[PDB]
Amino acid sequence: KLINELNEREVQLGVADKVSWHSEYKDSAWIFLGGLPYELTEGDIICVFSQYGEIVNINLVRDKKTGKSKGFCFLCYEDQRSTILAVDNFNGIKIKGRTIRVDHV
Amino acid sequence: NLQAQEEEREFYNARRREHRQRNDPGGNNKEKEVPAKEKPSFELSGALLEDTNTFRGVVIKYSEPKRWRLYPFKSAYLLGRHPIDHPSCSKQHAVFQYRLVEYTRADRVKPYIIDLGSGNGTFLNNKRIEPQRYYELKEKDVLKEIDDEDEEEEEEVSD
Amino acid sequence: PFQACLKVEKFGDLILKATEPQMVLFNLYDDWLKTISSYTAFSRLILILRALHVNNDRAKVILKPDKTTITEPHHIWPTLTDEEWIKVEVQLKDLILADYGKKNNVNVASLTQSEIRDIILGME
Amino acid sequence: RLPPEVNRILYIRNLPYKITAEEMYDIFGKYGPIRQIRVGNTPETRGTAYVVYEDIFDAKNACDHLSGFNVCNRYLVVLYYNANRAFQKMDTKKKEEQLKLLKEKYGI
Amino acid sequence: QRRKAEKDSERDELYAQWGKGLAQSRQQQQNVEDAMKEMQKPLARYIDDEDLDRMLRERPRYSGPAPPPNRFNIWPGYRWDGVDRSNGFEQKRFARLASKKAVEELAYKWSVE
Amino acid sequence: FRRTIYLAIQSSLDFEECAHKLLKMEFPESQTKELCNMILDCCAQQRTYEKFFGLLAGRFCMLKKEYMESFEGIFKEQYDTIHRLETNKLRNVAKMFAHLLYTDSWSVLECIKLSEETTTSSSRIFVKIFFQELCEYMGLPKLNARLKDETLQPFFEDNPRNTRFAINFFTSIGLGGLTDELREHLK
Amino acid sequence: ERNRPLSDEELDAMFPEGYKVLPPPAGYVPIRTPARKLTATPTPLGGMTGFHMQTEMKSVNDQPSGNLPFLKPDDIQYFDKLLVDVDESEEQKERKIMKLLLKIKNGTPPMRKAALRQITDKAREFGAGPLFNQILPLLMSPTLEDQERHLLVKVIDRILYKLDDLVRPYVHKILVVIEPLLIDEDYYARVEGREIISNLAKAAGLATMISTMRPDIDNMDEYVRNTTARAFAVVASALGIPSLLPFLKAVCKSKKSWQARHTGIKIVQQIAILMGCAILPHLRSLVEIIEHGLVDEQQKVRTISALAIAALAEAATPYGIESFDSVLKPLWKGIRQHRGKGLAAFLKAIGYLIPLMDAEYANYYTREVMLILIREFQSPDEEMKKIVLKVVKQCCGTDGVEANYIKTEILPPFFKHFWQHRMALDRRNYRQLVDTTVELANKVGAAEIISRIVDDLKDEAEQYRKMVMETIEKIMGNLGAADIDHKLEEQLIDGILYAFQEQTTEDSVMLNGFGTVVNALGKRVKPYLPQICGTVLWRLNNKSAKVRQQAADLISRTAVVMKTCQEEKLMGHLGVVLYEYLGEEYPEVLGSILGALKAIVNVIGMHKMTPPIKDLLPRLTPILKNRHEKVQENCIDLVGRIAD
Amino acid sequence: DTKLLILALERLKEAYSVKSRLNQSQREELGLIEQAYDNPHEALSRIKRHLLTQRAFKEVGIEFMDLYSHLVPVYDVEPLEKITDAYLDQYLWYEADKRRLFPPWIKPADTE
Amino acid sequence: PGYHAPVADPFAEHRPPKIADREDEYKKHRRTMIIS
Amino acid sequence: NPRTSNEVQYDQRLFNQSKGMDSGFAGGEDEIYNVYDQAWRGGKDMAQSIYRPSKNLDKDMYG
Amino acid sequence: DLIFCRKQAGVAIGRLCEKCDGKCVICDSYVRPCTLVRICDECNYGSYQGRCVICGGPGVSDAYYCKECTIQEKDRDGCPKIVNL
Amino acid sequence: LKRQEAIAQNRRLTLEDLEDSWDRGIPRINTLFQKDRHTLAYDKGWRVRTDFKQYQVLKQNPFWWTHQRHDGKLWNLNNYRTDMIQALGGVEGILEHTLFKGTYFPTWEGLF
Ligand SMILES: [Zn+2]
Ligand SMILES: [Zn+2]
Ligand SMILES: [Zn+2]
């Protein structure tokens, strides 16, 4: 929720690109999707987030014993600009009634 | 060495995906990209209601050959059992989703009938069609696979 | 860096092919003087020469970025617009400063404006 | 794909004092089944009416097409009716019997 | 312990090279080819051959519909759901940036007066 | 010289005046290639097709026998840049040669060929226009004549395949009323 | 949801008095019943509309009487009763005359004034019932403005200065609309809201408020619970803590459900924020309440609890340490075992606590906290980073902490993770970061911090440059420039000029920054002047309206430094050069120019002015017509200095 | 309605766009048009009220623009009636074009 | 024309410059509050 | 469920470039000037700042 | 809406901002600054350190009482830091 | 045609495929993409109102026949300036007639 208001202070003030805080990283593909719905699974979140790129490999944290999702996934794309696009875009999204959160790692 | 790990994974659709993306229940047969209502396609044809192309429906109860009503088709309609389905049908053999009729665009505004894979099937001119493909309908064609309490006919508006 | 000016294909080739002592003319500014002042064109020139003197081929990467970028026979350097010139100038300054600081083990974000101007322009 | 403020109730005005509920039901009956309709019989509220439908989207198509629609010489005022305001004239009660029923019949 | 420590360590190579951006790495690779062009092509102009064919033409990939424009112009993956799920910040961010371009011009129009 | 040409041409109303201004100056003749190369480039490079710059190239031909030659050459010089030029300026050219060729400054064409073998999709459009203009003047009948006496081959043949490419391609252009005889030949 | 079918008593519940239900037929009603089936059926059937050409009464109503300022197309629903012109025949005439509201809402400012008074003096007359009945719908309106809202708030205040015993039935019926004012983006809206709830609670009785507001504690939505908590905060500020204590102390021990205790604890907090410094007397009892939630099985209650301890201690600034006493030993233990937000919350509490302990006990305890504090720098949570940030301020700003330990353990990770472009773009993180860095400078010294952050003056983005710039400003403000060595000082002056040469917005931070830097450096700055003032003149041209005023002000604040070092040529420069700009047509520039002249007058004296006053003053005289403000200000000021 | 009113108001604003100090009456016109932007529904209702009622208007000023050959009449109206009439005009032309009132042979036409 | 008609608010620009909605999806439950 | 529409219609990058309505250009006053659409040079056209330094991008992309 | 807090007067010095700088608090006047202002840290604390006694900005100076309020002894009442209600 | 191909491809059209014709055509095709386009779609008869502005407004409009908002800008003179400066001998030669060397500006590239 705080993200979208940082993008609004970044757009409103005329930040103009490379000083963007996605340049904070430059080293990292893997993204963090928290607040995810428990019914979701690999193939699903792959099908929704391959929109903005091609996701190479994602490890979604699912509790070892019960074997169900703890509610979040660390994902890895083939492209960084896909990550920048995904954090800056796909965030604040409704899924199954609950708004997911995304951010770098 | 029967089951190494008890959980593993899926890589499969989720019920809330297909659910939320189609709801009246969740439905099947989301309209294709082409679908457009017939009247506006008669507007691009430059046709007032006199010379316009409107598909009217005709009913005959399969046992007794007329109108319980008359139905206009003028982008798609959901033929089902009755509430979800828009084109409700009193037929007790129709699955909760029986079939759909979508007008599509090919080369023109053309009517199409598509079976949803209803358990019994559906007969076209007393000749059934296999599931999961759009089948163009031509005027005067008939709809009811073998459970058939009714009949249907299609007419363009002319004369 | 008037020496590195002969690293250009055209000049070195011409000289190596030359069978007799002869005086030849060139215009290093091309058509630049149409849109810009003399002296500024002089700064662009020094940038180009020095940059050819340090990394050579990589300066050629800057000057030949896209194969859709062309150079005309009448001209020594490719045809570019003013926006393009400012960009390639920044890139050349980057080449010179980066390598200087890489040799002298200096963090080159810490150098001054006076220092940078000196380093680019000549001996400090 | 709807604005939240609109509700199943529509306030309708610019009505004649002679107007018949036959015309009312007929005209308004295009968009959907009527939940019901009230009409002011009182000195100030005469000329006004409230329409309520089994579904909101009914009312949405209504105010869409019925916007400034005509009757007699008049162009009716068609607005989405508010909520809350004067309510507590009635009470919250009589929940016990019905809730006891749903707790009885289905047993849940 | 050689093959095992090379499973974990060569996995440090694998997931290390994978981590950053496999898409990013190839683009970097292309630059390396560019250096090769420099060795033979010191100062290319016009008709020289790469330019020739160059102007002589002017692994599942997703099929259906269209993918809305992405600042960086990336086609979606193979099995992508085929549905736009977004905050719309791209468009609006995309639209707003365009609006500014109009603004710089109508800013100018002011100047002559 | 190249700059003086531009200034003389941008200065003058009419097409007549620029030639007078240009001839008057009595600039050196051999250059009478590049000059004309100048005019063909200067307007074609110029944003949209204008009647003036095309007329000028032609008159400059009738006045001296060489100027005509200088042009036909410059039309040849196109082959190299038939692909290369961007897809606007073909819109200036196709017509722009259309107006030298309707008014007789045709057989110089023949050099141009129809093949999937080598034709630039550039060149495809180039020639495409050229006919959709020149037609609009001669009106597809006088064009019937000019062709029928032309003996244009690389365009009009062997190669029944290339007769599908030809004839089809002139169904695509749309004229395709001068493709008849070739249709018969297919049969 | 809201589409659930309804009943005839529920139907009679919504609409107001005086309407009838109609069947026209039983048959048209059967059409309405088939309508559902026929919404599908008859929409699939023959239908169309057409018009014929034929020659052609038109009634309508605005609000006429004499004037009646205009009605928005929606507000008709509220004000329809005013539209009908039936007049002059009891209560119905009081509601009818009460439409003076409409005059308050929309109209000319005078109509709003006079109307407002007229309704103030009629309070005792009309009574609270009719008013609120005719108001609360408006203040509840979905289309409500900003101004209109605020004005209805005003009328509610002014009528609630009078009505006292009367409002008792309406108290809840008020608060329901008003509590949303407490949580708002606008500040003035919040201080207003707190004010009017203060007037309401004090206006009504304690038992009225209490007995009123209970059922909102267990309400399903947490929204009402929260804003209700702030409500109890306001009413508790009104009627005092001890009066309301037994209520709370009863609440936090409620054994029904946790949500209640969560609410009541939040109430403890918002009392801590609101009352603040004045909590002090009852601090002990309050703690004794809250302590039992730290060990509770539910999580929220624990989190919000410890948070409330935090707020307490922060308003408890140092005193009452032993009152928090029994709270500690669990907290420290929890510090070990927690993952996630609750952990950070504990760190918040303990953080505000440590300044209140003894440097011996807090020695040990602090040294324990430092470990986790280190480890936890790296979490992506921004709540985390806020907390641990302010913590680092309090823990490491302690007099009982050793420099070298901070210098080694802390500073490198601190500048690594914390100084990044995620932070600075945010507001609170910006400020708090500034403060914490300032304090670390206050301990470890100057040259360290500055020396590490100088290189960032030259960074691309503005806001970041602004951040390090104001940081350097405050630092050199407190510690003094004496500690700074030579080379780092070169990087300083160059940094400050460079950053100052690119200004996207107009703001003081860069300017006050520069001035403080120079005045702090003293005459160590002298070798740098010609570069400065060269930049000052060249910038003193540039493109006008943006930077002229700014370079001018730069001169103004650099006057004394350009004086005491005895560079006279520079005073000639600034004197006649600035003298020349007095013909500048842009006021916002000219003002800054005159200001600069002013500051130059306060350094070099009268008879030594390079532009002798005979020149200057009459050249100033005509400017007094100049209208726009800053000019008049600085001008009159300077005419004052010289005239005096 | 908002569309039309907006267009007409812009049109009126276009005569004064260069905007020297103008004069008193013109000042009234700018201030009143500016008013119309802030509270449009007010302006629309006032306008429709005029159109339904007032049959008597105020006096129009007249002056002659000099083309040195034939003079051109020039009329001056009070701002209120100018906004009213303006909206009346945008509306009339809009309905007219929608209904295909004017046959094609009348050609000071928008298309060409 | 029909092609330009295929190519077929500013008051909602200037009017929205007056006041604002200002609010999130969390706060709009205000609209669901009935009177007492 | 795809989100589908008839036809395609148009993209976005352009679909909102030039101002709106605005109307021509004054009654036709002499004082206006306004003949040229873009400025002469790129001095003020090319950038807000002709010069910014840094090696940040340099030492980042360097490797 | 705006009235004194009147908590007990402490030893903390008053702080006025740019705006209020010259004003004697109660008499609203600039004349004869003589004695000094005292308010409780309950009124002046934290974000109120060096805060204006009135508007809520940073104090650039210290308020001085007039001689008028001196002889009438009003400066000895509760802390004159205005609280909005 | 570009619309039809876009329809059959289902992919909407970008800027580039229209970059060719961007400034061309009597309606000046780019005028479709005006931001305010909605409002202007509801404006009619503009061309005749311009004809009768001569009576409402004192000043004389030469541009009466067209309007840039409906018809776009029908000319671009940007070249004329460049060619003008070229014909005079370039920037420097012109400046040789001026005081410029007096101002002691390093260059004219920044003259504003
Ligand atoms: Zn106090
Ligand atoms: Zn103050
Ligand atoms: Zn006093």
Residue numbers in the entry:
A (entry chain Y): 8 to 112
B (entry chain X): 171 to 194, 209 to 249, 257 to 265, 279 to 286, 293 to 317, 323 to 359, 378 to 379, 383 to 395
C (entry chain A): 1892 to 2015
D (entry chain 5): 12 to 119
E (entry chain Z): 480 to 537, 563 to 617
F (entry chain V): 455 to 559, 562 to 613, 619 to 648
G (entry chain 1): 394 to 449, 453 to 485, 490 to 1044
H (entry chain A): 835 to 946
Authors' account:
Pre-mRNA splicing is executed by a dynamic ribonucleoprotein complex known as the spliceosome. RNP remodeling of the B complex by the RNA-dependent ATPase/helicase Brr2 results in the dissociation of U1 and U4 snRNPs and the recruitment of about 20 protein components, forming the activated spliceosome (Bact complex). Conversion of the Bact complex into the catalytically activated B* complex by the ATPase/helicase Prp2 allows the branching reaction to occur, generating a 5′-exon and an intron lariat-3′-exon intermediate. In this manuscript, we report the cryo-EM structures of the human Bact complex in three distinct compositional and conformational states at resolutions of 4.9, 5.1, and 6.5 Å.
The final model of the human mature Bact complex contains 15 479 amino acids from 52 proteins and 414 nucleotides from three snRNAs and the pre-mRNA, with a combined molecular weight of about 1.8 mega-Daltons. The overall appearance of the human mature Bact complex closely resembles that of the S. cerevisiae Bact complex. First, the splicing factor Prp17 and the NTR proteins RBM22 and G10 (Bud31 in yeast) are fully loaded in the mature and late Bact complexes, but not in the early Bact complex. Perhaps most importantly, the Switch loop in Prp8 of the mature and late Bact complexes is positioned identically as that in the C or C* complex and interacts with the splicing factor SRm300 (Cwc21 in yeast). Careful examination reveals that, compared to the early Bact complex, the EM density for these two splicing factors is already weakened in the mature Bact complex. For example, in the mature Bact complex, the RNaseH-like domain of Prp8 interacts with the endonuclease-like domain, which directly binds to NY-CO-10. The RNaseH-like domain also associates with Bud13 of the RES complex. In the second step, the remaining NTC and NTR proteins, together with the NTD of SF3a66, the splicing factors SRm300 and Prp17 and the PPI CypE, are recruited, forming the mature Bact complex. One notable difference is the helix II of the U2/U6 duplex, which is bent by about 40° in the human Bact complex relative to that in yeast. Another marked difference is an extra turn of the U6/intron duplex in the human Bact complex beyond the U6/5′SS duplex, which results in the separation of the downstream human intron sequences away from those in S. cerevisiae by up to 40 Å.
